[PDB]
Amino acid sequence: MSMDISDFYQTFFDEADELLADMEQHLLVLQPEAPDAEQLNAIFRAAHSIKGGAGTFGFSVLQETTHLMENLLDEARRGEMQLNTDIINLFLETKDIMQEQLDAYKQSQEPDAASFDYICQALRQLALEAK
Amino acid sequence: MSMDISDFYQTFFDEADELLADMEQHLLVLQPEAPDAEQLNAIFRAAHSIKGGAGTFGFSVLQETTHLMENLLDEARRGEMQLNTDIINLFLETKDIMQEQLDAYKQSQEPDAASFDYICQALRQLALEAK
Amino acid sequence: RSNESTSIRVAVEKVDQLINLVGELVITQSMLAQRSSELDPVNHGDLITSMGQLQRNARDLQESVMSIRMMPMEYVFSRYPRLVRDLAGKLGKQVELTLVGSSTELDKSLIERIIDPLTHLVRNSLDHGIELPEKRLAAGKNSVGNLILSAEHQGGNICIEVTDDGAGLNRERILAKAASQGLTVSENMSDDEVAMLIFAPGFSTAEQVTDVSGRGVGMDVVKRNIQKMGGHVEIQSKQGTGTTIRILLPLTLAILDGMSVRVADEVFILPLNAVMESLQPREADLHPLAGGERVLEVRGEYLPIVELWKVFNVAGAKTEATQGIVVILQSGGRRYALLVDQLIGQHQVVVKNLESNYRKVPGISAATILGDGSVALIVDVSALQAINREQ
Amino acid sequence: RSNESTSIRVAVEKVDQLINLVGELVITQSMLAQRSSELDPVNHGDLITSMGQLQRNARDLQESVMSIRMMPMEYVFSRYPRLVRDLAGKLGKQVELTLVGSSTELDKSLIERIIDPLTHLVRNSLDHGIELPEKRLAAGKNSVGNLILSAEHQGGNICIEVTDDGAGLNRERILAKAASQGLTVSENMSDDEVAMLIFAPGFSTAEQVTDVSGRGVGMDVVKRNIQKMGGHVEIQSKQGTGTTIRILLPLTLAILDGMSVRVADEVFILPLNAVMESLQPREADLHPLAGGERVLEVRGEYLPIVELWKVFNVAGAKTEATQGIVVILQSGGRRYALLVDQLIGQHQVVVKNLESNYRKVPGISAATILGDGSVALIVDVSALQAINREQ
Amino acid sequence: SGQEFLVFTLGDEEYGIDILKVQEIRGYDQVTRIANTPAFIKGVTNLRGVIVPIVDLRIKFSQVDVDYNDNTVVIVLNLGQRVVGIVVDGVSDVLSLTAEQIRPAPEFAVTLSTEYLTGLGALGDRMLILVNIEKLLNSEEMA
Amino acid sequence: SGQEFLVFTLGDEEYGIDILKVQEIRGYDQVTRIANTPAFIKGVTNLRGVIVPIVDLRIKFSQVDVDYNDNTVVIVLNLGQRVVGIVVDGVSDVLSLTAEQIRPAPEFAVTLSTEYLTGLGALGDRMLILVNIEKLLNSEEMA
């Protein structure tokens, strides 16, 4: 025997909510005109954990949205992309949509397709224009 | 601006108690005579969250100890690593060491250096036998 | 390192069930506590003593279950920077959000309905309220704004304020829009009172709500959600200064504090929050009034005297104020008196909705039951406030 | 899909406060049910009936508060299989631990204390409860062993059994080791009775504490740890089949049903779990007995009469048993009479430790207040089972 | 199919209601009058911690002669969404009317509207009136 | 300031205890005898839902002449580990003994022991025997 699959789903929905909350507070103390190296790694390792469960249980809406952010933060901490007030505003606008899409799975509903196709472009296009 | 980060440290310890526990449940039901790729995915999810989750809070000892084990879980679920009664027992024994390292942070202390130098050589040794 | 702890996952449904169990417990002990007081103290000698210790422990466990169900306000304040730091750069402004009292907590069910109301207020401040950096320096005001989201506890309530240092809510613009829809206004209302008139149907900080604000939520819809939760709302703004919007939220809506008044056999109850003072007016403070009525002189001000026996048509009541008792009430800022026969005292009765088997009647808001068994009708203070206006 | 819900983290420290608040709540609430009993059911019928509502709500709330601290038993079942799969390889065996009933829950405080007790049982089943693979084939059994670990609810208790498939514990070794210690044993005892011999102090499955069966842990220590938690322990062994070890853990440890008796101005209480029935003594059934006591013929059995007035030296009580009443008791597969003066009925009250302001004697287990305010003394049934033999 | 009804007297006539809608019979006692309410409603009486409004049928039905002797009995109903009681001069009998005993009632009621009568109970020299208590306690006056 | 103590009478002799350890004073009340206990312990009585044993200090000291009256008084205490009362024939007068008035216990034989006595309270022509009721009720004999 084993625990019902619902526990793994509700657990990820609750854990993910806590990660988005703690991860969102990192950008608050992290000023856009002076990003600390130690703080950038905290945001990267935070969103990376959400990508694991998002891609295991079949959360394509959250896995894709989280995978793009993992690439931007990776190139920004190792020294491959600049950071300014414009990019910091995108993360805040991104984490907010991730919370809305995450709530859809809580109520057993499909996330808004318009929000997904709109946020993914803002993350992918930034990886090419910032270079 | 942001609540005290000390509150989140206790939250990660609570999630680890479930991840480490769930990580063992799948390792036990996973019979070494007839492994199941579906069960290996759940094992990687528990180890993937602790790896990216531990490092988010600055936990370096628990991160390195989980990264080495996670590398073996990724190659196992994808059919790139052999499993037997001896290899499965190593994963269960590894969970015991990871529990001791977790208790160190719960008491505001660092894990024992002797225990870390022993589990690492055990996981790295299996990588040479599998590869 | 002070002290650490741990936590375990608990379903919200299980925590909600505790409120139902303790709810009836607090309501059950309240009814039994009243019976022990009316009856003789002989048999209830030690019962009343133990009730005091249980009356306090009953609420301690209740507040404990609620506190465990609440969450820090920082979790709610962590979503405002997303709309402030982002919209400020898009529109071309500089606004710095400040958080005060982050240790405050709030019920989870209340957090799932107060984010959007508050989010709408912040959106209006970053469009109509706060101006551009150039316009602020021209009037001697600092270039960078200063949005403050305060929050703190209040005994059995929670206070949340949204202070702003923007252009401020215009006064002449609210009077012209409120009078058009048919709302009583006047020039005597100060800048703080006119600010409370933006709750008209389909209206908010600006006339263009549906056109500017995307979501169909405004001051009229915000106040609607507050009524469902049992809270209040207050605004203290002024032109050329700032803007502040206070929002209250209760914690327990099952007991109402009010004195039990008697009017010939029949017994009624009056809320305690509305009762100001009480005395026995004599011939040296009673004057007539147009329409066969009277007025009570309270420190020069002649307040209207409303007879409670006329509303309910109670036979054999004390028509004369010198024989009965007159209590000073208040509802909506204005005060008004109320005539009764005899008082009893302060008693915390349990609210009982009458709509479960009939419907609301004019002059009554709720009811309850005394210790013996008779039903007590809770008079509505809002209805009596409108009777004196017609006199 | 399967099921959707919501959950939030709850600090364990706050959970301990709930048990402390609800604990004293039931105590203070119990006092209300004491004085209220003095009222008559005719006039105060609604009050008495309403008083019971406040009591049952507190009991249901207490049981619900404990559930908040419980967790799924599946997490606890993750430590035994790892030991079996790890210990079986070292000893040279192939055992498979099967898990039954994963939906069961247990209090977190008990989970931290239920590991070593149960862990000691798993090591015993693998050390001698299951023979080598070669021996299993000779007896027609499968080479690969098996181990069951069931766990389901049984009303207000948590039942957990550990059954195996091997031959089980040795039979001649228990009797041989029990006779050396001076314990009353014999070969006529069945497999079920022989299993109740390892509970003696310093008596394990083997002649000495073996390292394989835990370090410094034995069956004698497992029992003492369960009594502190208000639980019990039972074994249902059988040579050739297996060995089942059951453990009980009540949910709440406060209220305890019991028969209230009186012995000359001294109202005592007797646990209801031991009470069987009662009857009127008869002179033809009473006969002498060693130690000044007497016996009572109860259907082909002369149960020993434990005069409660001689043990405690109660003056003024009815010395003649013919005028009094006897209450039959049972505990440990054997009965024992108990002479009293009068009876009352089934009264449910809260227990109290007399050591808080004095001390506890072998003839007393816990105190409690009655309806008339007088203090009562719950008579321990474990003592009466042995007092009849000492006298 | 056949249906049971509870018969009760109200003046010089006797009406009836469905037994399933009745909850329990109790004694008639003083009630707490509520002003600004219809005239056919007396007051309220708490029962098991629930406000149960009481109605007097003897005053309604366009009847002037009213009595309050010891035979006055109050009947507690249970209409799912509403639990309003009714007072009667005294419970008469109980009948297990069948399809042949329950005859359709006229369109013009004797003292009610055109949709507050379920039928007419026959019993030799006693013609019972099956009143539709379900809709009687949900008219414009009860809302 | 000097140490305050509560003085009381027990027939002929007089003793005293610390006022801080005393909680309140109230007349005699019914008690409940305990199964198999010494003779100097009357019983237990309910007090605000707490079991407060009642001990007779006059019988504990083992006196020759013992009397009983309806004017008995019971002084309620509040020790650091238990809440046991004491029976007294009648309170005397609260005093504030100083460092010079508190003398050591006698050298000859007395009722209690040296450990169960704090000293001697001098007050004119009335020698008071200070009793350490704290450790007395919490001694090995009472546990």
Side-chain angles (χ1 to χ4, degrees), chain F residues 60-87:
Chain F
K60 210 293 188 180
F61 305 151
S62 302
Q63 299 181 359
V64 187
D65 300 330
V66 180
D67 300 329
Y68 299 91
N69 300 89
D70 299 0
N71 300 330
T72 303
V73 186
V74 174
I75 302 174
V76 181
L77 304 179
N78 187 331
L79 303 179
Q81 300 181 0
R82 299 182 179 180
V83 184
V84 179
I86 55 178
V87 180

PDB file of all heavy atoms in Angstrom, chain F residues 60-87:
ATOM      1  N   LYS F  60      -1.258  16.501  64.933  1.00  0.00           N
ATOM      2  CA  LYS F  60       0.070  16.131  64.454  1.00  0.00           C
ATOM      3  C   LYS F  60       1.103  16.249  65.568  1.00  0.00           C
ATOM      4  O   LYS F  60       1.954  15.367  65.733  1.00  0.00           O
ATOM      5  CB  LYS F  60       0.455  17.011  63.264  1.00  0.00           C
ATOM      6  CG  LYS F  60       1.386  16.348  62.254  1.00  0.00           C
ATOM      7  CD  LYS F  60       2.762  16.066  62.833  1.00  0.00           C
ATOM      8  CE  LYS F  60       3.730  15.599  61.760  1.00  0.00           C
ATOM      9  NZ  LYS F  60       5.084  15.318  62.309  1.00  0.00           N
ATOM     10  N   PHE F  61       1.037  17.327  66.351  1.00  0.00           N
ATOM     11  CA  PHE F  61       1.983  17.531  67.441  1.00  0.00           C
ATOM     12  C   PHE F  61       1.824  16.512  68.561  1.00  0.00           C
ATOM     13  O   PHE F  61       2.665  16.480  69.466  1.00  0.00           O
ATOM     14  CB  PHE F  61       1.826  18.943  68.012  1.00  0.00           C
ATOM     15  CG  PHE F  61       1.955  20.036  66.985  1.00  0.00           C
ATOM     16  CD1 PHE F  61       1.293  21.241  67.155  1.00  0.00           C
ATOM     17  CD2 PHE F  61       2.733  19.861  65.852  1.00  0.00           C
ATOM     18  CE1 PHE F  61       1.406  22.248  66.216  1.00  0.00           C
ATOM     19  CE2 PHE F  61       2.849  20.865  64.911  1.00  0.00           C
ATOM     20  CZ  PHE F  61       2.184  22.061  65.093  1.00  0.00           C
ATOM     21  N   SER F  62       0.776  15.688  68.527  1.00  0.00           N
ATOM     22  CA  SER F  62       0.557  14.676  69.554  1.00  0.00           C
ATOM     23  C   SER F  62       0.427  15.320  70.928  1.00  0.00           C
ATOM     24  O   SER F  62       1.347  15.238  71.749  1.00  0.00           O
ATOM     25  CB  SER F  62       1.695  13.653  69.553  1.00  0.00           C
ATOM     26  OG  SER F  62       1.816  13.026  68.288  1.00  0.00           O
ATOM     27  N   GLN F  63      -0.708  15.960  71.186  1.00  0.00           N
ATOM     28  CA  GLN F  63      -0.976  16.606  72.462  1.00  0.00           C
ATOM     29  C   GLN F  63      -1.783  15.682  73.365  1.00  0.00           C
ATOM     30  O   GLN F  63      -2.367  14.690  72.922  1.00  0.00           O
ATOM     31  CB  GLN F  63      -1.729  17.924  72.252  1.00  0.00           C
ATOM     32  CG  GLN F  63      -0.966  18.945  71.425  1.00  0.00           C
ATOM     33  CD  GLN F  63      -1.730  20.242  71.252  1.00  0.00           C
ATOM     34  OE1 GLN F  63      -2.852  20.386  71.739  1.00  0.00           O
ATOM     35  NE2 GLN F  63      -1.124  21.197  70.556  1.00  0.00           N
ATOM     36  N   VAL F  64      -1.808  16.025  74.653  1.00  0.00           N
ATOM     37  CA  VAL F  64      -2.540  15.219  75.625  1.00  0.00           C
ATOM     38  C   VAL F  64      -4.018  15.584  75.618  1.00  0.00           C
ATOM     39  O   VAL F  64      -4.886  14.718  75.459  1.00  0.00           O
ATOM     40  CB  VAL F  64      -1.923  15.390  77.026  1.00  0.00           C
ATOM     41  CG1 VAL F  64      -2.571  14.423  78.016  1.00  0.00           C
ATOM     42  CG2 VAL F  64      -0.411  15.196  76.967  1.00  0.00           C
ATOM     43  N   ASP F  65      -4.327  16.866  75.790  1.00  0.00           N
ATOM     44  CA  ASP F  65      -5.701  17.350  75.818  1.00  0.00           C
ATOM     45  C   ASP F  65      -6.082  17.888  74.446  1.00  0.00           C
ATOM     46  O   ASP F  65      -5.408  18.776  73.912  1.00  0.00           O
ATOM     47  CB  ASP F  65      -5.871  18.438  76.879  1.00  0.00           C
ATOM     48  CG  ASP F  65      -5.539  17.950  78.275  1.00  0.00           C
ATOM     49  OD1 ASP F  65      -5.730  16.745  78.545  1.00  0.00           O
ATOM     50  OD2 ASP F  65      -5.089  18.769  79.103  1.00  0.00           O
ATOM     51  N   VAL F  66      -7.160  17.349  73.881  1.00  0.00           N
ATOM     52  CA  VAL F  66      -7.669  17.766  72.580  1.00  0.00           C
ATOM     53  C   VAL F  66      -9.130  18.156  72.740  1.00  0.00           C
ATOM     54  O   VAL F  66      -9.887  17.487  73.452  1.00  0.00           O
ATOM     55  CB  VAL F  66      -7.514  16.652  71.523  1.00  0.00           C
ATOM     56  CG1 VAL F  66      -8.047  17.118  70.174  1.00  0.00           C
ATOM     57  CG2 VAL F  66      -6.057  16.224  71.409  1.00  0.00           C
ATOM     58  N   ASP F  67      -9.526  19.240  72.074  1.00  0.00           N
ATOM     59  CA  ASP F  67     -10.890  19.738  72.143  1.00  0.00           C
ATOM     60  C   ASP F  67     -11.374  20.076  70.741  1.00  0.00           C
ATOM     61  O   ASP F  67     -10.582  20.221  69.805  1.00  0.00           O
ATOM     62  CB  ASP F  67     -10.995  20.974  73.049  1.00  0.00           C
ATOM     63  CG  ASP F  67     -10.559  20.691  74.472  1.00  0.00           C
ATOM     64  OD1 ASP F  67     -10.739  19.545  74.935  1.00  0.00           O
ATOM     65  OD2 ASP F  67     -10.038  21.616  75.131  1.00  0.00           O
ATOM     66  N   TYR F  68     -12.693  20.198  70.607  1.00  0.00           N
ATOM     67  CA  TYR F  68     -13.322  20.531  69.335  1.00  0.00           C
ATOM     68  C   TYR F  68     -14.479  21.483  69.592  1.00  0.00           C
ATOM     69  O   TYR F  68     -15.225  21.308  70.560  1.00  0.00           O
ATOM     70  CB  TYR F  68     -13.821  19.273  68.615  1.00  0.00           C
ATOM     71  CG  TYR F  68     -12.729  18.282  68.283  1.00  0.00           C
ATOM     72  CD1 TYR F  68     -12.398  17.262  69.166  1.00  0.00           C
ATOM     73  CD2 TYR F  68     -12.028  18.365  67.087  1.00  0.00           C
ATOM     74  CE1 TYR F  68     -11.401  16.353  68.867  1.00  0.00           C
ATOM     75  CE2 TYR F  68     -11.029  17.461  66.779  1.00  0.00           C
ATOM     76  CZ  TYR F  68     -10.719  16.457  67.673  1.00  0.00           C
ATOM     77  OH  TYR F  68      -9.726  15.554  67.373  1.00  0.00           O
ATOM     78  N   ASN F  69     -14.622  22.486  68.728  1.00  0.00           N
ATOM     79  CA  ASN F  69     -15.680  23.475  68.854  1.00  0.00           C
ATOM     80  C   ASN F  69     -16.179  23.854  67.467  1.00  0.00           C
ATOM     81  O   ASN F  69     -15.561  23.528  66.450  1.00  0.00           O
ATOM     82  CB  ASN F  69     -15.200  24.725  69.604  1.00  0.00           C
ATOM     83  CG  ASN F  69     -14.727  24.416  71.011  1.00  0.00           C
ATOM     84  OD1 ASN F  69     -13.556  24.113  71.232  1.00  0.00           O
ATOM     85  ND2 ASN F  69     -15.641  24.493  71.973  1.00  0.00           N
ATOM     86  N   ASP F  70     -17.316  24.553  67.438  1.00  0.00           N
ATOM     87  CA  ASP F  70     -17.897  24.980  66.171  1.00  0.00           C
ATOM     88  C   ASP F  70     -17.172  26.177  65.573  1.00  0.00           C
ATOM     89  O   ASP F  70     -17.382  26.489  64.396  1.00  0.00           O
ATOM     90  CB  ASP F  70     -19.377  25.316  66.360  1.00  0.00           C
ATOM     91  CG  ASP F  70     -20.188  24.130  66.843  1.00  0.00           C
ATOM     92  OD1 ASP F  70     -19.601  23.043  67.028  1.00  0.00           O
ATOM     93  OD2 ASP F  70     -21.412  24.284  67.038  1.00  0.00           O
ATOM     94  N   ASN F  71     -16.325  26.856  66.352  1.00  0.00           N
ATOM     95  CA  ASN F  71     -15.581  28.017  65.881  1.00  0.00           C
ATOM     96  C   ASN F  71     -14.240  27.642  65.261  1.00  0.00           C
ATOM     97  O   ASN F  71     -13.319  28.470  65.236  1.00  0.00           O
ATOM     98  CB  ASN F  71     -15.373  29.005  67.031  1.00  0.00           C
ATOM     99  CG  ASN F  71     -16.680  29.498  67.618  1.00  0.00           C
ATOM    100  OD1 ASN F  71     -17.689  29.598  66.919  1.00  0.00           O
ATOM    101  ND2 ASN F  71     -16.668  29.811  68.908  1.00  0.00           N
ATOM    102  N   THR F  72     -14.103  26.417  64.761  1.00  0.00           N
ATOM    103  CA  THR F  72     -12.850  25.994  64.151  1.00  0.00           C
ATOM    104  C   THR F  72     -12.584  26.791  62.880  1.00  0.00           C
ATOM    105  O   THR F  72     -13.509  27.150  62.146  1.00  0.00           O
ATOM    106  CB  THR F  72     -12.892  24.499  63.834  1.00  0.00           C
ATOM    107  OG1 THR F  72     -13.167  23.760  65.030  1.00  0.00           O
ATOM    108  CG2 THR F  72     -11.562  24.036  63.251  1.00  0.00           C
ATOM    109  N   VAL F  73     -11.307  27.067  62.624  1.00  0.00           N
ATOM    110  CA  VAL F  73     -10.876  27.833  61.462  1.00  0.00           C
ATOM    111  C   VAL F  73      -9.823  27.027  60.716  1.00  0.00           C
ATOM    112  O   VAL F  73      -8.985  26.360  61.334  1.00  0.00           O
ATOM    113  CB  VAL F  73     -10.319  29.215  61.865  1.00  0.00           C
ATOM    114  CG1 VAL F  73     -10.022  30.053  60.627  1.00  0.00           C
ATOM    115  CG2 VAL F  73     -11.294  29.934  62.785  1.00  0.00           C
ATOM    116  N   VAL F  74      -9.869  27.087  59.388  1.00  0.00           N
ATOM    117  CA  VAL F  74      -8.929  26.382  58.524  1.00  0.00           C
ATOM    118  C   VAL F  74      -8.200  27.420  57.682  1.00  0.00           C
ATOM    119  O   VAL F  74      -8.831  28.161  56.917  1.00  0.00           O
ATOM    120  CB  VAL F  74      -9.635  25.349  57.631  1.00  0.00           C
ATOM    121  CG1 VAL F  74      -8.646  24.734  56.646  1.00  0.00           C
ATOM    122  CG2 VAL F  74     -10.298  24.272  58.483  1.00  0.00           C
ATOM    123  N   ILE F  75      -6.879  27.471  57.820  1.00  0.00           N
ATOM    124  CA  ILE F  75      -6.053  28.417  57.080  1.00  0.00           C
ATOM    125  C   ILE F  75      -5.591  27.745  55.794  1.00  0.00           C
ATOM    126  O   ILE F  75      -4.894  26.724  55.831  1.00  0.00           O
ATOM    127  CB  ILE F  75      -4.854  28.884  57.921  1.00  0.00           C
ATOM    128  CG1 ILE F  75      -5.339  29.528  59.224  1.00  0.00           C
ATOM    129  CG2 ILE F  75      -3.996  29.864  57.126  1.00  0.00           C
ATOM    130  CD1 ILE F  75      -4.225  29.898  60.183  1.00  0.00           C
ATOM    131  N   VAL F  76      -5.977  28.316  54.658  1.00  0.00           N
ATOM    132  CA  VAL F  76      -5.586  27.780  53.359  1.00  0.00           C
ATOM    133  C   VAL F  76      -4.188  28.271  53.016  1.00  0.00           C
ATOM    134  O   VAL F  76      -3.865  29.452  53.192  1.00  0.00           O
ATOM    135  CB  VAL F  76      -6.604  28.186  52.278  1.00  0.00           C
ATOM    136  CG1 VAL F  76      -6.213  27.600  50.929  1.00  0.00           C
ATOM    137  CG2 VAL F  76      -8.006  27.743  52.673  1.00  0.00           C
ATOM    138  N   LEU F  77      -3.353  27.363  52.520  1.00  0.00           N
ATOM    139  CA  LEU F  77      -1.975  27.662  52.160  1.00  0.00           C
ATOM    140  C   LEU F  77      -1.797  27.544  50.652  1.00  0.00           C
ATOM    141  O   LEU F  77      -2.726  27.201  49.914  1.00  0.00           O
ATOM    142  CB  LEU F  77      -1.002  26.721  52.884  1.00  0.00           C
ATOM    143  CG  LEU F  77      -1.110  26.694  54.411  1.00  0.00           C
ATOM    144  CD1 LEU F  77      -0.120  25.704  54.999  1.00  0.00           C
ATOM    145  CD2 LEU F  77      -0.895  28.082  54.997  1.00  0.00           C
ATOM    146  N   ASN F  78      -0.576  27.837  50.196  1.00  0.00           N
ATOM    147  CA  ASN F  78      -0.217  27.775  48.783  1.00  0.00           C
ATOM    148  C   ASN F  78       1.296  27.554  48.700  1.00  0.00           C
ATOM    149  O   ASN F  78       2.081  28.450  48.394  1.00  0.00           O
ATOM    150  CB  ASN F  78      -0.644  29.041  48.036  1.00  0.00           C
ATOM    151  CG  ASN F  78      -0.445  28.931  46.535  1.00  0.00           C
ATOM    152  OD1 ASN F  78       0.445  28.223  46.064  1.00  0.00           O
ATOM    153  ND2 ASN F  78      -1.277  29.634  45.777  1.00  0.00           N
ATOM    154  N   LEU F  79       1.718  26.323  48.980  1.00  0.00           N
ATOM    155  CA  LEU F  79       3.131  25.988  48.944  1.00  0.00           C
ATOM    156  C   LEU F  79       3.646  26.004  47.505  1.00  0.00           C
ATOM    157  O   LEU F  79       2.887  26.117  46.539  1.00  0.00           O
ATOM    158  CB  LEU F  79       3.373  24.619  49.578  1.00  0.00           C
ATOM    159  CG  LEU F  79       2.879  24.455  51.018  1.00  0.00           C
ATOM    160  CD1 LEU F  79       3.152  23.045  51.518  1.00  0.00           C
ATOM    161  CD2 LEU F  79       3.522  25.485  51.934  1.00  0.00           C
ATOM    162  N   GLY F  80       4.967  25.888  47.371  1.00  0.00           N
ATOM    163  CA  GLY F  80       5.596  25.887  46.061  1.00  0.00           C
ATOM    164  C   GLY F  80       5.412  24.605  45.276  1.00  0.00           C
ATOM    165  O   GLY F  80       5.808  24.559  44.106  1.00  0.00           O
ATOM    166  N   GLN F  81       4.829  23.572  45.885  1.00  0.00           N
ATOM    167  CA  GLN F  81       4.607  22.302  45.199  1.00  0.00           C
ATOM    168  C   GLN F  81       3.254  21.669  45.480  1.00  0.00           C
ATOM    169  O   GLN F  81       2.840  20.795  44.711  1.00  0.00           O
ATOM    170  CB  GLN F  81       5.703  21.296  45.572  1.00  0.00           C
ATOM    171  CG  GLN F  81       7.108  21.742  45.198  1.00  0.00           C
ATOM    172  CD  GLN F  81       8.162  20.718  45.568  1.00  0.00           C
ATOM    173  OE1 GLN F  81       7.851  19.662  46.120  1.00  0.00           O
ATOM    174  NE2 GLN F  81       9.418  21.026  45.266  1.00  0.00           N
ATOM    175  N   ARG F  82       2.545  22.063  46.537  1.00  0.00           N
ATOM    176  CA  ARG F  82       1.244  21.497  46.860  1.00  0.00           C
ATOM    177  C   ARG F  82       0.354  22.594  47.427  1.00  0.00           C
ATOM    178  O   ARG F  82       0.792  23.724  47.663  1.00  0.00           O
ATOM    179  CB  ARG F  82       1.366  20.337  47.856  1.00  0.00           C
ATOM    180  CG  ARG F  82       2.192  19.167  47.349  1.00  0.00           C
ATOM    181  CD  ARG F  82       2.237  18.038  48.367  1.00  0.00           C
ATOM    182  NE  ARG F  82       3.002  16.895  47.883  1.00  0.00           N
ATOM    183  CZ  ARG F  82       3.197  15.777  48.571  1.00  0.00           C
ATOM    184  NH1 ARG F  82       2.695  15.615  49.785  1.00  0.00           N
ATOM    185  NH2 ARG F  82       3.912  14.797  48.027  1.00  0.00           N
ATOM    186  N   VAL F  83      -0.913  22.247  47.644  1.00  0.00           N
ATOM    187  CA  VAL F  83      -1.888  23.177  48.200  1.00  0.00           C
ATOM    188  C   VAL F  83      -2.679  22.466  49.289  1.00  0.00           C
ATOM    189  O   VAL F  83      -3.833  22.075  49.082  1.00  0.00           O
ATOM    190  CB  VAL F  83      -2.823  23.727  47.106  1.00  0.00           C
ATOM    191  CG1 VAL F  83      -3.767  24.771  47.687  1.00  0.00           C
ATOM    192  CG2 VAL F  83      -2.013  24.312  45.958  1.00  0.00           C
ATOM    193  N   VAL F  84      -2.062  22.292  50.456  1.00  0.00           N
ATOM    194  CA  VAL F  84      -2.677  21.617  51.591  1.00  0.00           C
ATOM    195  C   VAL F  84      -2.954  22.647  52.676  1.00  0.00           C
ATOM    196  O   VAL F  84      -2.122  23.521  52.945  1.00  0.00           O
ATOM    197  CB  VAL F  84      -1.780  20.483  52.127  1.00  0.00           C
ATOM    198  CG1 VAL F  84      -2.428  19.812  53.332  1.00  0.00           C
ATOM    199  CG2 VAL F  84      -1.497  19.466  51.030  1.00  0.00           C
ATOM    200  N   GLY F  85      -4.129  22.543  53.299  1.00  0.00           N
ATOM    201  CA  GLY F  85      -4.528  23.446  54.353  1.00  0.00           C
ATOM    202  C   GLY F  85      -4.113  22.949  55.732  1.00  0.00           C
ATOM    203  O   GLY F  85      -3.474  21.913  55.895  1.00  0.00           O
ATOM    204  N   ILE F  86      -4.499  23.727  56.739  1.00  0.00           N
ATOM    205  CA  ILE F  86      -4.200  23.421  58.132  1.00  0.00           C
ATOM    206  C   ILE F  86      -5.363  23.894  58.991  1.00  0.00           C
ATOM    207  O   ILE F  86      -5.938  24.959  58.744  1.00  0.00           O
ATOM    208  CB  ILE F  86      -2.879  24.075  58.592  1.00  0.00           C
ATOM    209  CG1 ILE F  86      -2.911  25.584  58.332  1.00  0.00           C
ATOM    210  CG2 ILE F  86      -1.697  23.432  57.881  1.00  0.00           C
ATOM    211  CD1 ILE F  86      -1.665  26.314  58.789  1.00  0.00           C
ATOM    212  N   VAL F  87      -5.709  23.100  60.001  1.00  0.00           N
ATOM    213  CA  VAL F  87      -6.801  23.411  60.916  1.00  0.00           C
ATOM    214  C   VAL F  87      -6.223  24.071  62.158  1.00  0.00           C
ATOM    215  O   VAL F  87      -5.196  23.631  62.691  1.00  0.00           O
ATOM    216  CB  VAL F  87      -7.596  22.144  61.284  1.00  0.00           C
ATOM    217  CG1 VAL F  87      -8.732  22.485  62.241  1.00  0.00           C
ATOM    218  CG2 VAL F  87      -8.132  21.470  60.030  1.00  0.00           C
TER     219      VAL F  87
END
